[PDB]
């Protein structure tokens, strides 16, 4: 319930760290921006993974583990998309 809101915010934060770093890049280098892409996707994946662990450890029903894990997957994916768009702005 509040777990939706916490994750949606946390994942939005990730794409802002990208939005910032890409914009000063916008303001060796093509190599640099591909590195930042791989890092921020690796941050989204890692956080996804972390949340799934915490979810699977909770004493809740499977249906609930399923709703929560799918909520969290969808945001993580929405973030990979939004960040994939920023690499294209460079490339």
């Amino acid at each position, epitope marked *: 319930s509040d777990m939706r809101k916490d994750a949606e915010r946390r994942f939005d934060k990730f794409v802002e760290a990208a939005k910032n770093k890409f914009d000063k890049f916008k303001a060796d280098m093509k190599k640099l921006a591909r590195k930042e892409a791989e890092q921020a996707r690796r941050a989204v994946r890692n956080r*996804l*993974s972390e949340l*799934l*662990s915490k979810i*699977n450890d909770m004493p809740i029903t*499977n249906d609930q583990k*399923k709703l929560m*894990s*799918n909520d969290v*997957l969808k945001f993580a994916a929405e973030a990979e998309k939004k960040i994939e768009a920023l690499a294209a702005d460079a490339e």
Partner: antibody
Amino acid sequence: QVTLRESGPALVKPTQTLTLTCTFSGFSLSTAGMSVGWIRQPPGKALEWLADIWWDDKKHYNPSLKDRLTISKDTSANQVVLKVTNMDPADTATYYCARDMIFNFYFDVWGQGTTVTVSS
Amino acid sequence: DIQMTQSPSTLSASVGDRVTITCSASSRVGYMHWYQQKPGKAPKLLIYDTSKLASGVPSRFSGSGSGTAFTLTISSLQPDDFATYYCFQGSGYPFTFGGGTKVEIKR
């Protein structure tokens, strides 16, 4: 291409232990969300879920097989092993492994199954 | 632990008929899944999350329901829909399947 492939003996004597092994590829038990489960089907009867294991190493077993099951994983080898103790003739069945996800809580990909006969 | 009853357990119908299989559960589940199994093959997932279609599954298949009562529908039976169909619940441990329903063809 997600594939699973069950292996083990076709024949087991009554009271002995059966050791089954699932080998898979196209996915990994190191990935968050992933699970492998075992299901069996006696000849001409219904499917019966036996066990599963998750990527965080959490396990579940069917109480109907009360204490005869051990499941375990080898992530690096992409292999899950299932051990069934004190086999009796009613355990004669086709044994299947299949892939499950915390997003699904259902099996979307199965091996072809391996047939086990309990007999002297 | 949740047990499911399928009706009928056996069924014959002609090619082109509408066929319905019901799976009532012993208590509430959030979702029902359906497997199709042909002669000496592994079960293939057919319908998941109650009404959503799996891949390589024609549109003539569909599911509905909620709570304890669910249906699988084949809207125009084909010869290759010959199989045994099982419902399956993953909402609770242990996981369980219905007893099955044999679909046979009349010609």
